[PDB]
Design an enzyme around this catalytic site. Structure first.
Site, PDB file in Angstrom:
ATOM      1  N   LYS A  94       0.812  -1.214   0.000  1.00 53.75           N
ATOM      2  CA  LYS A  94       0.000   0.000   0.000  1.00 53.75           C
ATOM      3  C   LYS A  94       0.852   1.274   0.000  1.00 53.75           C
ATOM      4  O   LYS A  94       0.541   2.234  -0.701  1.00 53.75           O
ATOM      5  CB  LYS A  94      -0.966   0.014   1.195  1.00 53.75           C
ATOM      6  CG  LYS A  94      -2.055  -1.067   1.168  1.00 53.75           C
ATOM      7  CD  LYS A  94      -2.837  -1.075  -0.145  1.00 53.75           C
ATOM      8  CE  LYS A  94      -4.273  -1.563   0.044  1.00 53.75           C
ATOM      9  NZ  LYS A  94      -4.381  -2.998   0.436  1.00 53.75           N
TER      10      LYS A  94
ATOM     11  N   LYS B 287      -3.090   3.178  10.116  1.00 49.49           N
ATOM     12  CA  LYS B 287      -3.048   1.884   9.442  1.00 49.49           C
ATOM     13  C   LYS B 287      -1.611   1.476   9.119  1.00 49.49           C
ATOM     14  O   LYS B 287      -1.097   0.488   9.650  1.00 49.49           O
ATOM     15  CB  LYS B 287      -3.877   1.937   8.156  1.00 49.49           C
ATOM     16  CG  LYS B 287      -3.379   2.957   7.143  1.00 49.49           C
ATOM     17  CD  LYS B 287      -4.491   3.414   6.206  1.00 49.49           C
ATOM     18  CE  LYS B 287      -4.963   2.302   5.279  1.00 49.49           C
ATOM     19  NZ  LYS B 287      -6.116   2.742   4.443  1.00 49.49           N
TER      20      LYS B 287
ATOM     21  N   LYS C 265      -6.334  10.789   5.468  1.00 48.67           N
ATOM     22  CA  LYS C 265      -7.682  11.316   5.612  1.00 48.67           C
ATOM     23  C   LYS C 265      -8.727  10.206   5.565  1.00 48.67           C
ATOM     24  O   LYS C 265      -8.686   9.345   4.687  1.00 48.67           O
ATOM     25  CB  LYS C 265      -7.964  12.343   4.513  1.00 48.67           C
ATOM     26  CG  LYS C 265      -9.200  13.183   4.782  1.00 48.67           C
ATOM     27  CD  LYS C 265      -9.165  14.498   4.022  1.00 48.67           C
ATOM     28  CE  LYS C 265     -10.088  15.524   4.652  1.00 48.67           C
ATOM     29  NZ  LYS C 265      -9.720  15.828   6.069  1.00 48.67           N
TER      30      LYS C 265
ATOM     31  N   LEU D 214     -12.421   9.361   4.707  1.00 52.48           N
ATOM     32  CA  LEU D 214     -13.551   9.891   3.964  1.00 52.48           C
ATOM     33  C   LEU D 214     -14.822   9.215   4.445  1.00 52.48           C
ATOM     34  O   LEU D 214     -14.936   7.989   4.423  1.00 52.48           O
ATOM     35  CB  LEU D 214     -13.348   9.670   2.471  1.00 52.48           C
ATOM     36  CG  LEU D 214     -11.990  10.143   1.953  1.00 52.48           C
ATOM     37  CD1 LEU D 214     -11.947  10.055   0.439  1.00 52.48           C
ATOM     38  CD2 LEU D 214     -11.686  11.558   2.428  1.00 52.48           C
TER      39      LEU D 214
ATOM     40  N   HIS E 173     -17.185   4.042  -4.357  1.00 54.03           N
ATOM     41  CA  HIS E 173     -16.109   3.248  -4.924  1.00 54.03           C
ATOM     42  C   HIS E 173     -16.184   3.343  -6.432  1.00 54.03           C
ATOM     43  O   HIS E 173     -17.043   2.728  -7.050  1.00 54.03           O
ATOM     44  CB  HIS E 173     -16.232   1.784  -4.515  1.00 54.03           C
ATOM     45  CG  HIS E 173     -15.144   0.917  -5.062  1.00 54.03           C
ATOM     46  ND1 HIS E 173     -14.145   0.390  -4.272  1.00 54.03           N
ATOM     47  CD2 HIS E 173     -14.885   0.499  -6.324  1.00 54.03           C
ATOM     48  CE1 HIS E 173     -13.327  -0.327  -5.021  1.00 54.03           C
ATOM     49  NE2 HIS E 173     -13.755  -0.279  -6.269  1.00 54.03           N
TER      50      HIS E 173
ATOM     51  N   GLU F 189      -5.983   1.572  -4.254  1.00 51.68           N
ATOM     52  CA  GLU F 189      -5.420   0.277  -4.601  1.00 51.68           C
ATOM     53  C   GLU F 189      -5.417   0.089  -6.103  1.00 51.68           C
ATOM     54  O   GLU F 189      -6.313   0.558  -6.800  1.00 51.68           O
ATOM     55  CB  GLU F 189      -6.245  -0.836  -3.935  1.00 51.68           C
ATOM     56  CG  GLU F 189      -6.135  -2.229  -4.573  1.00 51.68           C
ATOM     57  CD  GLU F 189      -5.128  -3.136  -3.877  1.00 51.68           C
ATOM     58  OE1 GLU F 189      -4.971  -4.299  -4.315  1.00 51.68           O
ATOM     59  OE2 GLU F 189      -4.497  -2.693  -2.898  1.00 51.68           O
TER      60      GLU F 189
ATOM     61  N   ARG G 211      -4.462  -7.307 -12.060  1.00 51.88           N
ATOM     62  CA  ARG G 211      -5.062  -8.554 -12.482  1.00 51.88           C
ATOM     63  C   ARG G 211      -6.400  -8.209 -13.101  1.00 51.88           C
ATOM     64  O   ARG G 211      -6.822  -7.057 -13.068  1.00 51.88           O
ATOM     65  CB  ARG G 211      -5.286  -9.466 -11.273  1.00 51.88           C
ATOM     66  CG  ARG G 211      -6.117  -8.815 -10.184  1.00 51.88           C
ATOM     67  CD  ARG G 211      -6.509  -9.782  -9.080  1.00 51.88           C
ATOM     68  NE  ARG G 211      -7.112  -9.095  -7.942  1.00 51.88           N
ATOM     69  CZ  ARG G 211      -8.370  -8.659  -7.894  1.00 51.88           C
ATOM     70  NH1 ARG G 211      -9.179  -8.815  -8.932  1.00 51.88           N
ATOM     71  NH2 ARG G 211      -8.817  -8.049  -6.806  1.00 51.88           N
TER      72      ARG G 211
ATOM     73  N   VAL H 296     -13.239  -9.344 -10.959  1.00 51.73           N
ATOM     74  CA  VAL H 296     -14.502 -10.067 -11.008  1.00 51.73           C
ATOM     75  C   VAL H 296     -15.489  -9.332 -11.899  1.00 51.73           C
ATOM     76  O   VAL H 296     -16.114  -9.928 -12.771  1.00 51.73           O
ATOM     77  CB  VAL H 296     -15.117 -10.210  -9.588  1.00 51.73           C
ATOM     78  CG1 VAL H 296     -16.524 -10.777  -9.657  1.00 51.73           C
ATOM     79  CG2 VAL H 296     -14.238 -11.088  -8.707  1.00 51.73           C
TER      80      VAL H 296
ATOM     81  N   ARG I 286     -23.596 -10.234  -8.172  1.00 41.26           N
ATOM     82  CA  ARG I 286     -22.875 -11.434  -7.775  1.00 41.26           C
ATOM     83  C   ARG I 286     -23.816 -12.363  -7.046  1.00 41.26           C
ATOM     84  O   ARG I 286     -24.191 -12.104  -5.897  1.00 41.26           O
ATOM     85  CB  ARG I 286     -21.728 -11.092  -6.834  1.00 41.26           C
ATOM     86  CG  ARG I 286     -20.722 -10.158  -7.418  1.00 41.26           C
ATOM     87  CD  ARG I 286     -19.458 -10.197  -6.599  1.00 41.26           C
ATOM     88  NE  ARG I 286     -18.519  -9.185  -7.037  1.00 41.26           N
ATOM     89  CZ  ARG I 286     -17.257  -9.122  -6.642  1.00 41.26           C
ATOM     90  NH1 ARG I 286     -16.775 -10.024  -5.796  1.00 41.26           N
ATOM     91  NH2 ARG I 286     -16.479  -8.156  -7.096  1.00 41.26           N
TER      92      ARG I 286
END
Lengths: 411, 411
Positions: free
Chosen positions: B116, B155, B168, B170, B175, B254, B258, B261, B304
Site C-alpha cells: 500500500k 493503518k 484522511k 472519507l 467506490h 489500490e 489482475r 470479477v 454477484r
C-alpha cells in the site's frame, strides 16, 4: 396507452414478448392451450387464461377465445407473435373491431401483403425491385416466357416446348431480408439486413446479420426503398421485406407483416429492441430513434435449436431431463425450455434460439461453435450436430452461400 | 506465441478464461483440486491435471504443483484469474524464471503495487490523485493529523486528544474504479469506470458501468492519469485503479494488478473483450484498439449471485437440484454452475454473475430485476433476495449511493 397485453402465442416468442412487456411495466395475459400450462412465460405471466385443448386449430388459432380473453381481463392490446394468427387479416380486423389494439399492421395492409400478386404490385408501384414476371393463350405466354427468360416458374419450366399449366426462376440466389419499423407519426426506418440462406425445405436453420458482401451503399439503397414502401402502403409496426439476392441485384418475394423469428441478430448489430419498438409503436409512440442513429456494428449469428433428429429431422418430443444453456460474452439465449420441461408434440419443434455476437463474422462463428459445444439438452434429440456441421463448413466460413446449399451439402 | 495456457484458477473465472482461449484457438490445461473434478471448465478443458486436495493452500495456492502442470503439459503461459496467486509476486517470479509466460504484470510491478505504501508513492509520482496523508513523535503526528484534517485513520481517530497507535478518512465516498490495459508496445488505454459502492464488509455485491454522475470530461482526466501511470510503472496487461470518490474528487486506494470479477460490465459498455486482450497482450501483441476507438455506450449492471443465506450471509453449499438461468436481450450469464452440480464448501460462495445491459441505467436495472425473477436455483439458498431489495431501493435507483449505504440500509 398500453397497460395490459394479451400474448396470443406460445414458446420462445411468447417469452420474448413477456420480457419486453415487463420491462415497460405492461401487465401480461398469457393465453394458452391445455398442453402449455407449464410454459415458462405462462408461469411468469400476471394473468393466465386457457383458450382450448392442445391442437392449434382449437387454441392458438381460436379467434373468438383469444378475443374473449382480452375482454374478460380488460386488456388493451393483443400481440400475435409470429406464425399462428399474426398475418391473419380477419383476426386483425376482428381485434380492432372489438376495440383492442392489434400489435402489428392494419388489417387492410396485412391483406394487401397477404396475397403474393397484390403484394408484388404494391412493391413495384413503390419502387422496390421485383422478380421480372408476367406482371392462358399459347403464343402470348410463350412470348412472356421468352421476354422474362428461362428458366421460369408457374405458380419450373426450363424450355418452351414444355410450357404448361409466371416469373423468373433464380438458380442460385441468397435469402437477404431487410428489417423495417414504421410508426403512426409518418416515420419509417430500415435496420440493415439479415442473410437466411441456410435453409432446408425453405425452413430457416441459421441466420446472420449483416449479410456478407453487402456494402453500406447497397444497404442504404435497398433499405430506403423498403422504408418508402412502408410509407406508401401505410405500414405500421415491425416488418420484413424478404428478397432473393443474386449477381448483385435484389428481387422481392414476400413481406412478413409481423416480427420475425430471427429478429435477434438485427438487435445485436444495431442496438435496437424490436419487440419493445413494436409495443411503443402500437401505443401510438414514434420510433425511438432516427435513421441516422442506426449504425451496423459487429456481426451476429443465430442457430435455431430444434427437438428433432439431426439427420432424419423427425420431431423428438419428450422430457428434458437436463438443460445446460451456454453463456459468457457475446452469447444470448432465447428459450422457454427449462430443466424438467416436457417438449410437446402439438406445435413446432423449436426449443431455443442461440444467438452470438462478435466484432467480426469470424468471432461470431467461433463463439457460436463454442456455445454449441457447451450446450446440453438431455432426454431428447436436437439438431445441434447439424449446426456444428454448418459452422465448420468451409463455404459457410467464406460466406455468401446460396439458398440451395444446405440441401446440396446434405447429399 | 501462446499455444497452450494453464488456467490457474477455478469456478466462473476459469470458465471465462477457457472461453477466451477456445475463441483464440488456444489449448487449455485445467489444474484443479480433488473437489473440483466436476467443474464445468474442467469438463470442457483439453487437458486436466489434479494439483492437490480440496483446501486452497494445498491446491490453487500450491506454486510448485501448478508450475509442474505447466511443465509436464508443455504449456506456454499461465493465467492466474483473480484471487489466489494472481497478485502473488513470488509466483509470478517463479513462473517467468521457469520459462513460462505469466498472463499479467511483471513480478517487480506486482510487488510495487502489492504494498500500500510503495503503491501510493508510485501513484503520487505518476500524477494520480491520492488520499492526503502522512506521505512516532507526539507533536509531529499531531501536526500531520492537523494538516490532513480529522477524521483520520491509523493503518479511526476523530479528535487529537485520542491520537494513538495516517491519512484522511472519507466519511461517505463512492467506490469508483478505472479499467486499464497496457501492452508491450508502449500503449496504455482506459476503459471508462465502474461504480462498486454497494458492498458488505468491503465485499462487492453489485457493480455498474459507467459510474453515475461521472462526465466524459472527468472520465478523460482521471483515465489519462491512470494510463500514464501504467506507462510510468511499466505496466503490462489488464489492471484496475480503485478510487474513493467524494465531493467530485478521486483518491487512489489500490491497484488490482489482475483481471477483476466485475470486468463484464465494462465489456458491455465499451465492446472490449478484456480476457482476450489479456491473452493477446501476454503473447506480445498490441492492444487491439486505440483510446479514440473507445466510446461508452449504454449502461451495464452486475449482481454477484452467491450460495449464501440472504440475511444471515452464511454459506449454503450443496447440490443444485435445479438451475434455470435467465436470458433474452441484454442479459448475460457468467457461471460455471449447472443443474446437478454440487457447490462445495472449500472456496468462495460465488456461483454466478448475472450481467445486464441497456441503452440507459433505468433499462439495465429493470432488465436485472426481470432476469433475477426468472432465475431459479433450487437446493441451496442464494442472495437473490438481497439483490432484489437493492434494485428496488429508491436511493439506488437515483444512483450515487456511497460505500456505507448497504450496511446502513440493512439496519
Amino acid at each position: 396507452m398500453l397497460e395490459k397485453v394479451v400474448i396470443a402465442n406460445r414458446g420462445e416468442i411468447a417469452l420474448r414478448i413477456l420480457r419486453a412487456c415487463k420491462e415497460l411495466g405492461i401487465k401480461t395475459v398469457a393465453v394458452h392451450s391445455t398442453a402449455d400450462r407449464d410454459l415458462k412465460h405462462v408461469l411468469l405471466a400476471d394473468e393466465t387464461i386457457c383458450i382450448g385443448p392442445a391442437p392449434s386449430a382449437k387454441s392458438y388459432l381460436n379467434i373468438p377465445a383469444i378475443i374473449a380473453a382480452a375482454e374478460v381481463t380488460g386488456a388493451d392490446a393483443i400481440h400475435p407473435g409470429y406464425g399462428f394468427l399474426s398475418e391473419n387479416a380477419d383476426f386483425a380486423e376482428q381485434v380492432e373491431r372489438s376495440g383492442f389494439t392489434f400489435i402489428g399492421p392494419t388489417a387492410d395492409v396485412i391483406r394487401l401483403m397477404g396475397d403474393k400478386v397484390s403484394a408484388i404490385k404494391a412493391m413495384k408501384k413503390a419502387g422496390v425491385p421485383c422478380v421480372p414476371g408476367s406482371d392462358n393463350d399459347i403464343a402470348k405466354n410463350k412470348e412472356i416466357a421468352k421476354r422474362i427468360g428461362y428458366p421460369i416458374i408457374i405458380k419450373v419450366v426450363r424450355s418452351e416446348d414444355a410450357l404448361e399449366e409466371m416469373e423468373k426462376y433464380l438458380e442460385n440466389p441468397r435469402h437477404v431480408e431487410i428489417q423495417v419499423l414504421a410508426d403512426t407519426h409518418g416515420n419509417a426506418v430500415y435496420l440493415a439486413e439479415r442473410d437466411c440462406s441456410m435453409q432446408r425445405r425453405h425452413q430457416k436453420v441459421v441466420e446472420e446479420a449483416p449479410a456478407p458482401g453487402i456494402t453500406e451503399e447497397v444497404r442504404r439503397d435497398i433499405g430506403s426503398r423498403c422504408a418508402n414502401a412502408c410509407v406508401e402502403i401505410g405500414y405500421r409496426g415491425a416488418g420484413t421485406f424478404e428478397f432473393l439476392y443474386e449477381n448483385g441485384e435484389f428481387y422481392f418475394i414476400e413481406m412478413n407483416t409481423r416480427i420475425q423469428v430471427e429478429h435477434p441478430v438485427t438487435e445485436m448489430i444495431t442496438g435496437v429492441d424490436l419487440v419493445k419498438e413494436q409495443l411503443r409503436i402500437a401505443a401510438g409512440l414514434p420510433i425511438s430513434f432516427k435513421q441516422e442513429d442506426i449504425k451496423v456494428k459487429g456481426h451476429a449469428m443465430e442457430c435455431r435449436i430444434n427437438a428433432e433428429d439431426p439427420k432424419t429431422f423427425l420431431p423428438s418430443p419428450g422430457k428434458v431431463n437436463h438443460l445446460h444453456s451456454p453463456g459468457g460474452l457475446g452469447v444470448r439465449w432465447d428459450s422457454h425450455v427449462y430443466g424438467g420441461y416436457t417438449v410437446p408434440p402439438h406445435y413446432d419443434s423449436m426449443i431455443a434460439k442461440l444467438i452470438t455476437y462478435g466484432d467480426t463474422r469470424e468471432v461470431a462463428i467461433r463463439r457460436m461453435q463454442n456455445a454449441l459445444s457447451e450446450t446440453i439438452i438431455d432426454g431428447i434429440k436436437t439438431n445441434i450436430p447439424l449446426h456444428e456441421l454448418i459452422l465448420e463448413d468451409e463455404n459457410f466460413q467464406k460466406g455468401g452461400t446460396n439458398i440451395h446449399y444446405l440441401e446440396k451439402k446434405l447429399g
